[PDB]
């Protein structure tokens, strides 16, 4: 593939350097149009700028603390952190969010990696060989209410069991109702004065509940679970203006009041280098 063609002096009524940007078109003007050029080759395919490479590597999306301890005399196992629930979203960790939000619609198969790591901050004699259950709870399915509820049975729900310290890895096909996920939704659930803007179930990947299936030991062991998401077979539409200001909420384009200027003010005038 040719990068630069050979081009000599130009004395022409065709002025490739003159155009009208008022047209909204970016004319493919080359160095060969402005200067005298030598022949060069690309030696480059552009493999790393493909959306599958750009959007298609693993990223931390969720981190959660859960405790394996005695469940006696506890009324809410979700809030005592015997299990925690995560409404699946890629909009909670901003670095990945910005990448996805370069586009309006994205259709990808997912590949999750869950890494559970234990810690016994208080007196412990040993490192317990805990097994975490990661349970996929799609909308409508009974969300677990107790750490050993009938829900965890997962007779129809997808579920993964893996040892703490070790990891789980499972693929998930594109689960969107539409032909693509909406990174942005300029609309409502219905025509209602108080209904939620932007937030829609078009992006309801589902939920993930995490428990340690082990019974309690005498010591408290804190398990920090980290969910990693990798997009595969990525298709992306409608490129957007990159995010400039920081986020405030999941699924909202909201930015903080009194936020700092993002355009990097010069030292000196417009003439400075």
């Amino acid at each position: 593939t040719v990068a630069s063609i050979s081009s000599g002096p130009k004395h022409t009524q065709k002025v490739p350097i003159l155009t009208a940007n008022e047209t909204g078109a970016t004319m493919p003007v080359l160095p060969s149009d402005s200067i005298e050029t030598r022949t060069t080759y690309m030696h480059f395919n552009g493999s790393e700028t493909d959306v599958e490479c750009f959007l298609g590597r693993a990223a931390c999306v969720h981190v959660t603390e859960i405790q394996n301890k005695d469940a006696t005399g506890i009324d809410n196992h979700r809030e005592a952190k015997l299990f925690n629930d995560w409404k699946i979203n890629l909009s909670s960790l901003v670095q990945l969010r910005k990448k996805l939000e370069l586009f309006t619609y994205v259709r990808f198969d997912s590949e999750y990696t869950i890494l559970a790591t234990a810690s016994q901050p208080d007196s412990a004699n040993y490192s317990s060989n805990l097994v975490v259950q990661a349970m996929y709870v799609p909308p409508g399915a009974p969300n677990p209410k107790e750490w050993d509820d009938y829900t965890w049975q997962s007779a129809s729900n997808p579920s993964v069991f893996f040892k703490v310290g070790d990891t789980s890895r499972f693929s998930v096909p594109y689960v969107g109702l539409a032909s693509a996920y909406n990174c942005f939704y300029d609309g409502y659930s219905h025509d209602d004065a108080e209904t939620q803007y932007g937030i829609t179930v078009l992006n309801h990947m589902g939920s993930m509940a995490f428990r340690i299936v082990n019974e309690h030991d005498e010591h408290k062991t804190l398990v920090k679970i980290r969910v990693y998401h990798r997009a595969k077979h990525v298709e992306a539409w409608i490129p957007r203006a990159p995010r400039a200001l920081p986020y405030t909420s999941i699924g909202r384009t909201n930015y903080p009041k009194n936020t700092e200027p993002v355009i990097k003010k010069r030292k000196g005038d417009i003439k400075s280098y």
Binding site: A20, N21, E22, T23, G24, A25, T104, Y105, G176, A178, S179, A180, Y181, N182, C183, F184, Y185, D186, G187, Y188, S189, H190, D191, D192, A193, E194, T195, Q196, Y197, G198, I199, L202, I238, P239, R240, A241, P242, R243, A244, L245, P246, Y247, T248, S249, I250, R252, T253, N254, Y255, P256, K257, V262, I263
Partner: protein, 256 residues
């Protein structure tokens, strides 16, 4: 062989737009608007294609461009909800699908200076000014032919109106990634942007959801000659095309 690309005529239905200072029309993503094909269709109901009774130019109430104007934003199909038969069909049907020919008009003398950015943003999800997880209320996102004036004050439950941040936390300079055209008064008096139907679904509710958002933003401020009225009218004219409606039904009631 002589003629001109600045002199254009668009005839849709019984409506005709002419321009003598046109910049080359933009066709968003090089894709012309088309009826939904059977291979992409989900809804089984035979779609009403209303032809020339709706596929015509509706001119929107003019805006006044001053030296201190920040800009204006319209939502589609929202802006055309009160426009003739299109609006009626919009409210009588559960599902709607439409492309648009947007035509923005701002004429001035050869002594005038200023540049408008006319840009079409698909899924222009607005940001609340209250920050946090505060929602933008239905009434503010669906203003109608009035649109949103970005020079105005904020309202409780209303959107953020700092044109610099595109009302969404992105920078103004980058809007050029979206299908856009400038009205540079020295060059151009009319922008035109043909919008196809852009959605993740083949057809959608026209009332609850706005597919695209038209923004007209002064970049280079209006500089009028000495002794002139420090104002120019900006007139927006929109024509639906390849419009489809499905699931006819009792007229939908919306807020306000």
């Amino acid at each position: 062989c002589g003629y001109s690309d600045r002199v254009q005529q668009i005839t849709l239905g019984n409506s005709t737009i002419t321009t003598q200072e046109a910049a080359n029309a933009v066709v968003c993503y090089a894709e012309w608007p088309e009826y939904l094909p059977d291979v992409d269709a989900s809804d089984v109901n035979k779609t009403s294609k209303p032809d020339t009774s709706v596929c015509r130019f509706y001119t929107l109430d003019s805006k006044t461009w001053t030296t201190g104007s920040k800009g204006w934003c319209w939502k589609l199909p929202d802006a055309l909800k009160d426009m003739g038969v299109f609006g009626q069909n919009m409210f009588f049907h559960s599902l709607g699908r439409s492309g648009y020919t947007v035509h923005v008009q701002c004429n001035a003398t050869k002594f005038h200076s200023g540049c408008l950015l006319v840009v079409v943003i698909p899924e222009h999800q607005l940001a609340s000014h209250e920050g946090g997880n505060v929602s933008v209320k239905y009434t503010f996102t669906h203003p109608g032919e009035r649109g949103i004036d970005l020079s105005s004050a904020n309202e409780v439950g209303g959107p953020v109106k700092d044109v610099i941040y595109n009302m969404n936390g992105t920078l103004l300079g980058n809007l050029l990634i979206f299908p856009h055209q400038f009205i540079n008064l020295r060059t151009n008096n009319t922008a035109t942007i043909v919008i196809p139907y852009i959605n993740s679904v083949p057809i959608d509710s026209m009332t609850r959801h706005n597919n695209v958002s038209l923004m007209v933003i002064p970049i280079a401020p209006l500089t009028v000659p000495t002794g002139a009225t420090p104002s120019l009218p900006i007139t927006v004219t929109i024509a639906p095309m390849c419009t489809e409606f499905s699931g006819i039904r009792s007229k939908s009631i919306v807020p306000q």
